[PDB]
Each structure stands twice: as structure tokens, then as C-alpha cells.
Amino acid sequence: YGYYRTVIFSAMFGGYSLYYFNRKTFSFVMPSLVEEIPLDKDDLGFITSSQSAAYAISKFVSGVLSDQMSARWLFSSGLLLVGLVNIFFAWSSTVPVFAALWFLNGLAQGLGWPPCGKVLRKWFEPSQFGTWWAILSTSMNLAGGLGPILATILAQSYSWRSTLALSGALCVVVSFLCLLLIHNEPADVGLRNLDPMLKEESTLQELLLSPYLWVLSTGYLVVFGVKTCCTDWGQFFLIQEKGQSALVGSSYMSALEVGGLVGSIAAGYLSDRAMAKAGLSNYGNPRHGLLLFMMAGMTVSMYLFRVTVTSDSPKLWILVLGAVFGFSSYGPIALFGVIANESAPPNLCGTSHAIVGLMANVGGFLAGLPFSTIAKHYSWSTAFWVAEVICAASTAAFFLLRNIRTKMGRVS
Numbered sequence: 407y408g409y410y411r412t413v414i415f416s417a418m419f420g421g422y423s424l425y426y427f428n429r430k431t432f433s434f435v436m437p438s439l440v441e442e443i444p445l446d447k448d449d450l451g452f453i454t455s456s457q458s459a460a461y462a463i464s465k466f467v468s469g470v471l472s473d474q475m476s477a478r479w480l481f482s483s484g485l486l487l488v489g490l491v492n493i494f495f496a497w498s499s500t501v502p503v504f505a506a507l508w509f510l511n512g513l514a515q516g517l518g519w520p521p522c523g524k525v526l527r528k529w530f531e532p533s534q535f536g537t538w539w540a541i542l543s544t545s546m547n548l549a550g551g552l553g554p555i556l557a558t559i560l561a562q563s564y565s566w567r568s569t570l571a572l573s574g575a576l577c578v579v580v581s582f583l584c585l586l587l588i589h590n591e592p593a594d595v596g597l598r599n600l601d602p603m604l605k606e607e608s609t610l611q612e613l614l615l616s617p618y619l620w621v622l623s624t625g626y627l628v629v630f631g632v633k634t635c636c637t638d639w640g641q642f643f644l645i646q647e648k649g650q651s652a653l654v655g656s657s658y659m660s661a662l663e664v665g666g667l668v669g670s671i672a673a674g675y676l677s678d679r680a681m682a683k684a685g686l687s688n689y690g691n692p693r694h695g696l697l698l699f700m701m702a703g704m705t706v707s708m709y710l711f712r713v714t715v716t717s718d719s720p721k722l723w724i725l726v727l728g729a730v731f732g733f734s735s736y737g738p739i740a741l742f743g744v745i746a747n748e749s750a751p752p753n754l755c756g757t758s759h760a761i762v763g764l765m766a767n768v769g770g771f772l773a774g775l776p777f778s779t780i781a782k783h784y785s786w787s788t789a790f791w792v793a794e795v796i797c798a799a800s801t802a803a804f805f806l807l808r809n810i811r812t813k814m815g816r817v818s
């Protein structure tokens with residue numbers, strides 16, 4: 407029994423990191439690409455947005471029909487397609503072609519997320535799902551940190567083409583391995599399935615009218631959209647306007663991801679500690695106080711980065727701002743998942759998470775072409791100023807709505 411749970415969870419952890427590294431490989435190798443194939447700021451945006459659009463369509467549709475699909479096949483198939491797209495991209499040299507391959511990568515990526523959830527419920531008792539989900543989430547943060555550094559070093563003699571085209575062969579091999587290892591159900595290998603686990607079931611039309619659902623959703627679009635702006639365009643702001651080199655720009659990229667690793671873990675640990683001292687009720691959520699502090703740090707940290715950082719600034723001051731931003735950015739994302747689960751009606755628990763995910767990727771879309779267009783017209787600094795203002799305004803609005811009703815659905 408135990409031997410099987412370790413092999414599976416490790417395997418899913420391994421697979422998830424590779425989907426992500428491959429989703430972002432484009433951002434990792436962007437400075438080099440621009441130098442070899444010269445491109446305008448706007449062109450870069452179109453390629454980034456195209457992936458975000460596909461992912462959103464795929465992730466919403468997939469979840470709805472996932473109850474009809476097998477996890478072992480779905481995870482493996484998705485990985486193979488992502489890998490093949492990466493190989494082709496390196497060979498290709500023109501922008502219209504690059505964008506279409508990126509859309510295809512986005513759609514394949516969608517296939518991966520629903521299976522992970524199904525195995526987790528099936529092999530682990532419902533009580534522990536929360537802990538496992540968070541450990542699994544850390545896979546992304548590890549991959550994201552390792553990659554930028556690897557690129558700024560591997561590009562010493564190798565081409566951008568050959569450093570993206572191994573991230574395809576490795577994907578194919580690991581897809582085969584994960585097809586071999588993952589098992590859909592405990593009954594498949596001979597072990598007994600886990601023991602299976604009618605009070606005012608709200609109708610779907612009553613869910614969409616809940617005031618707290620939108621405050622929790624639009625508050626997730628702003629945080630996620632801002633995190634994508636600094637993840638993709640933060641490197642060119644230092645390279646072009648701040649007079650920094652490419653190595654320093656990629657060093658800031660890794661320190662951003664490392665900060666979130668200690669941020670997601672601390673957010674879960676700190677949240678329930680405060681929850682046990684007050685308790686839960688219909689009006690308000692005790693984790694609001696912790697969420698406001700993390701959001702406050704995010705807007706303050708970005709303000710110092712735009713103004714204080716310059717060519718004279720030492721390397722240490724650049725990294726510390728990135729690390730603090732990573733802690734303050736990834737922290738709300740972990741809390742938003744927990745808050746949605748408890749507030750959601752028991753009968754519509756699954757649909758509530760899907761709705762939040764839909765508006766999640768819309769924020770990523772706005773961080774692509776619309777953000778790049780503002781930067782090209784005036785400057786990179788002008789575009790980042792707009793992102794700072796939007797984040798600050800959201801915190802004040804969410805502050806005033808801290809005492810609204812949270813339990814979605816008709817409450818007697």
C-alpha cells in the first residue's frame with residue numbers, strides 16, 4: 407500500500423514541474439531570442455497572450471468533462487504534446503508561426519491539471535487533501551527558479567534553439583515514464599479502495615448572485631495579473647532602462663520564485679493558527695486580516711523597485727526586493743484557494759473553483775498584449791506605473807468589503 411502512494415505522488419510532483427518549466431521556457435530564453443531575431447515589444451506580447459487564451463478555454467472545458475476521463479492516459483498525453491511543440495518552436499523562425507505553436511502548447515497544458523486532483527482524492531483521505539495540494543503546488547516554484555539561471559549560463563556557447571530543444575526530448579521521455587508509473591485507482595493494483603465519505607442544496611443560478619464570489623474572484627485576477635507582469639517583463643525593465651546586464655536580470659527572476667516558496671508554505675501555516683483563536687461565522691472570514699497584510703506588502707515592494715533601483719544600486723538590493731515581492735505575491739494565491747472551498751456551498755463545491763479559475767487566466771491575458779502595448783507607446787516605466795496603481799486600488803476596495811457576507815448561496 408504505502409509503496410504505491412510514494413511512487414505516485416513523487417511521479418505527479420515530477421510531471422507538474424516539467425509542464426510548468428515548459429510553459430515558461432519562452433520567458434526564460436527571451437532576451438537571447440530578441441537579439442538573434444529582432445522583434446518589437448508588441449510582437450512579444452502577442453505570443454505570450456496566445457498561450458493564456460488557450461489555457462483558459464482548455465482548463466474550463468476540461469474540468470467539466472473530466473469525470474469521463476482516465477488520469478494515467480491524460481497526464482501522459484498532455485506532456486508529449488507540450489514537448490513536441492517545444493522542439494518545433496526552436497526550428498521555426500517567424501512570428502506568425504511562433505504564435506500558433508504557442509496556442510497549441512496552451513491547450514495541451516490544459517489537459518494536465520484535472521487529472522492531478524482526481525488521483526489526490528482517490529489515494530489520500532479527504533482530510534489530508536489540503537496539505538498534499540500545497541506540497542504539489544511547490545513544484546512550480548522549484549522549476550521556475552532553476553530555469554532562468556540555467557539559461558543565462560547555458561547560453562554561453564549554445565544557441566537558444568538548442569537550449570529549448572532538449573526541453574522537448576526530456577518531456578517525451580518523462581511522459582513515457584509517467585505513463586508507466588501513475589495508477590488511476592487503488593483497486594487496479596489489488597488494494598481496496600478508500601472508504602466513501604442534503605441540507606439546502608443551492609441551485610446554480612443562486613450561486614452567481616452571491617456578492618462575495620465576485621470580490622473573491624476579481625481580487626484574484628488583480629493579484630495573478632500583477633504576478634505575471636513581473637514574471638515576464640521584469641527582466642527587460644532592468645536590462646533596457648536600469649542599465650543592468652542580462653545575468654543580473656535573470657538573477658532577479660530566480661529570487662522572485664524563491665520568495666514564493668517560503669510564502670506559500672508560511673501562508674498555510676499562519677492562516678489556521680489565527681483561525682483557531684477566533685473561530686468561523688457567517689459574516690466575515692478570519693483569514694482576511696492575514697490577506698490584507700500580504701497584499702499591502704506587494705504594492706509597497708513594487709514602488710521601491712521602480713524608483714530606488716538604478717545603475718548605481720548594488721546587486722543585493724535588487725534581489726531583496728524580488729524576494730520580498732515573491733513572498734507577498736504567492737501568499738494570497740494559496741489563501742484564495744482555501745477561502746473558496748469553505749465559502750462554497752457543499753453541493754456546488756467543484757463548480758465554485760472552476761469559476762474562479764476562469765477569471766484567473768483573464769488576468770494573465772491582460773499581462774500580455776494589452777500591457778506590452780502601453781509599454782511600447784511611452785516606456786516600460788509608464789506601463790509598470792499603471793500596474794502599481796491598479797494593485798493599490800484593489801487593496802483599498804477589498805479592505806472596505808472585509809465585513810460583507812461570505813457564505814455563498816441563500817442563507818436563512
Ligand SMILES: O=C(/C=C/c1ccc(O)c(O)c1)O[C@@H]1C[C@](O)(C(=O)O)C[C@@H](O)[C@H]1O
Pocket residue numbers: 519535536537539742743744746747758759760762763766
Ligand atoms: O481547488 C482549489 C483548492 C482546493 C482546496 C484547498 C484547501 C482545502 O483544505 C481543500 O479541502 C481544498 O483551488 C483551486 C486551485 C487552482 O485550480 C490551481 O491553482 O490549480 C486555481 C483555482 O481554481 C483554485 O480555486
